Amino acid sequence: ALISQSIKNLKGGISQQPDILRYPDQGSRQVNGWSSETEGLQKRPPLVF
Amino acid sequence: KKSLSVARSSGGGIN
Amino acid sequence: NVIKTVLTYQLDGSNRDFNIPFEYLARKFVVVTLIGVDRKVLTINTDYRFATRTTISLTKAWGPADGYTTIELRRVTSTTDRLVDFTDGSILRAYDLNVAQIQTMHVAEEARDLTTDTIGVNNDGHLDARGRRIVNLANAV
């Protein structure tokens, strides 16, 4: 049967636990990303010389 | 009428 | 073009019922006149009757023997006297707004249908006198 789940906010950063133990909002990798409270995942602000 | 997504406040950290 | 407030029908001497196609707010706004040698206006309850709200029943049958070829049903909506006048303390109602709009609409229609009281073009390309005399033409050359 067709099933569907959505992850409202990718705000959990990364987790090093097995995938069966992770929260839906935690990923595996997140490099140069910003976890905003109201804008979700963003690129980190650019490095200004 | 297909079932609705269960409202999960969920959490963070180690589980 | 075609007048909708003035309806005139042939008088055969045996038919006493005539249709009212136009709208009206009061039976006094409907004027019944017999046309012939002269134009005789009929009275509301002694010469005719409103059999239905769309039908006028004559008490007596009129025809060419009586000297009347046609009968005319014409709406004449009051212009000085309005049926609805709003006051400062009165509840605004849908019926009052409708009657106020319709009365002005009838007065506007009768002005636009006033080609009956003049010489205007009928359905054909002919100027129509509608069975009345062009008096005071006097000499011609």
Binding site: - | - | T8, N19, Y95, N123
Partner: protein, 196 residues
């Protein structure tokens, strides 16, 4: 379309509206005059709709046969009012239609008449002028349609469906009793065949 809201309220029309209101459990209103009662206004609109619809079906009491419609002597136009629920010929195929609010002869392609035409016509009548059985059917059908649109109760739907069927049956009994139709001597064809 004839206005239903713009004349004096009659006892039967007021009774009809309160009957329609009762179908969904609304209490009766004292007057049909505007009191911002949306339910009563809705009921009167459906009442007028059903009143026009059942009359337009055609019955011996309301089908007028041999009626003369007279033209205007200066325009030769016969008005086809919106209150003409049905307009037919007295016999055979009908030839008159509505074109621009006037009677139009589709066979001769003309709307000009030098003399009156004879038609089988149904003209809109007041709900007062309806026979008692037909008044009950109009109210029953209006009550059913009122509940369907503005309450939607399925239990009320089933009972009003049965009531309408009974109401229509009793109007059909009125139709035959009023009609007094005979297939032997009241028949257009068989009566000629009965002569010896």
């Amino acid at each position: 379309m004839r206005s239903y809201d713009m004349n004096v309220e009659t006892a039967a029309e007021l009774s009809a509206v309160n009957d329609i209101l009762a179908s969904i459990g609304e209490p009766p209103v004292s007057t049909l005059e505007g009191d911002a009662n949306a339910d009563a206004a809705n009921a009167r609109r459906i009442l007028n709709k059903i009143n026009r619809q059942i009359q337009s079906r055609g019955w011996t009491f309301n089908i007028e046969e041999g009626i003369t419609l007279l033209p205007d002597v200066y325009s030769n136009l016969i008005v086809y009012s919106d209150d003409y629920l049905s307009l037919m010929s007295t016999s055979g195929q009908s030839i008159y239609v509505n074109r621009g609010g006037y009677v139009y002869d589709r066979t001769s392609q003309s709307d000009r008449f030098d003399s009156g035409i004879t038609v089988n016509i149904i003209r809109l009548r007041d709900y007062d002028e309806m026979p008692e059985c037909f008044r009950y059917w109009i109210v029953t059908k209006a009550s059913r349609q009122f509940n369907n649109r503005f309450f939607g109760a399925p239990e009320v739907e089933g009972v009003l469906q049965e009531e309408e069927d009974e109401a229509r049956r009793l109007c059909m009994e009125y139709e035959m009793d009023y009609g007094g139709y005979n297939m032997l001597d009241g028949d257009a064809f068989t009566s000629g065949l009965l002569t010896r």
